[PDB]
Amino acid sequence: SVPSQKTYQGSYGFRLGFLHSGTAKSVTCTYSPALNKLFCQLAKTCPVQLWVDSTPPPGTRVRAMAIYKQSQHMTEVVRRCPHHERCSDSDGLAPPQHLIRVEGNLRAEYLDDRNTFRHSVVVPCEPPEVGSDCTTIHYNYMCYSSCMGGMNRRPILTIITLEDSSGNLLGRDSFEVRVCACPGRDRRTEEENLRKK
Numbered sequence: 551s552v553p554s555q556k557t558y559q560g561s562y563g564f565r566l567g568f569l570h571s572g573t574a575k576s577v578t579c580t581y582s583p584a585l586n587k588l589f590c591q592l593a594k595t596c597p598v599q600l601w602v603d604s605t606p607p608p609g610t611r612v613r614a615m616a617i618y619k620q621s622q623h624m625t626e627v628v629r630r631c632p633h634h635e636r637c638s639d640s641d642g643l644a645p646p647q648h649l650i651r652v653e654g655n656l657r658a659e660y661l662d663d664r665n666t667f668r669h670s671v672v673v674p675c676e677p678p679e680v681g682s683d684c685t686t687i688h689y690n691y692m693c694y695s696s697c698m699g700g701m702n703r704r705p706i707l708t709i710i711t712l713e714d715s716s717g718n719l720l721g722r723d724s725f726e727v728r729v730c731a732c733p734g735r736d737r738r739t740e741e742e743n744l745r746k747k
């Protein structure tokens with residue numbers, strides 16, 4: 551089966567936000583609103599903001615999961631390639647097969663779904679701390695889009711779901727991801743291709 555990717559703000563007005571990092575050659579993570587697409591280097595910090603209109607209940611959680619974007623690949627589990635799943639880059643918590651990690655959150659939990667075999671990482675939803683108006687989760691993507699035997703140049707989407715304590719849906723948002731060596735250049739190229747089309 552294929553998890554839903556339908557945008558759903560829900561009762562709490564849940565949606566994502568992204569920094570404005572630009573497209574310089576030195577950028578390691580950059581988000582294109584025109585493409586709804588995050589470009590990032592391998593295993594680099596990807597800040598993703600969570601915005602709500604009202605505070606969800608204690609025990610609300612935030613889950614991230616990757617799926618293939620293309621119709622003909624949506625049913626295939628997104629995982630790390632045969633090389634990276636055997637890398638000695640464990641953080642002590644993420645299973646080595648998981649593409650998406652949460653960085654610097656000891657309450658992150660990693661799920662291997664017993665029925666779909668899909669991977670996800672989930673953290674407690676925290677209120678913005680004093681001063682701030684949103685919360686930020688720091689994600690890492692642990693394979694390249696181009697990795698042979700893994701994503702194999704196929705685009706993926708990340709689906710972020712707001713869930714209650716039972717895992718029921720409260721809100722949903724999503725974005726395409728390209729994990730690549732040159733995020734700034736590739737974002738420039740793809741935004742140009744979009745402008746030409």
Ligand SMILES: [Zn+2]
Pocket residue numbers: 630631632633634635692693694697698700
């Ligand atoms: Zn890989």
